Amino acid sequence: NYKDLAEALQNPKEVRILDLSENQLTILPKEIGKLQKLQLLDLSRNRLITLPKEIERLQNLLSLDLNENQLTTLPKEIGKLQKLQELGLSGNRLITLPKEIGQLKNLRWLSLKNNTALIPQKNKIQKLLPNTNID
């Protein structure tokens, strides 16, 4: 359980919960990929623009909170997060979602509120994630 990435990275295999919310982050360092036991990651209320492709290494991740950032795109590698059950994307600037998000077979909770560009894509997005509660 950590609130600091530098601190988490001193023993990357002991970190299961990481709360980096409200840390004014503009990038997520690719070193995040060494936290391979991570199960919950809170990145809400930062200034992120996208995610590194190394996010794919968080294979044990269950919840990913990116609410209230500045995200314009997600890498296709987001679809490799096989265990992911919750994804918070509210309040970003997303132009689209990658089709690979449909590979998230365990995704149950997805928040997309206040992503203007996605509003016309709603029905398409629900057909891509037909077992996901989408807010």
Going from the N-terminus, what domains does the chain have, and what CATH number goes with each? Answer: 5-134 (3.80.10.10)
Residues paired with residue 86 on neighbouring β-strands, in sequence order? 63, 109
CA distance 11 to 82: 24
CA distance 101 to 87: 11
CA distance 55 to 80: 9
Resolution of the solved structure (Å) = 2.0
- Cβ atoms of 35 and 18 closer than 8 Å: yes
- Cβ atoms of 112 and 88 closer than 8 Å: no
Helix (H, G, I), strand (E, B) or coil at 121: helix
- Cβ atoms of 16 and 38 closer than 8 Å: yes
Q: Which of 82, 84, 86 is CA-nearest to residue 65? A: 86
Structure method: X-ray
CA distances from 125 to 89, 121, 122 (A): 13, 6, 5
CA distance 97 to 134: 13
Q: What share of the chain is helix, strand, coil (3-state, %, to 5)?
A: 25, 15, 60
CA distance 36 to 72: 25
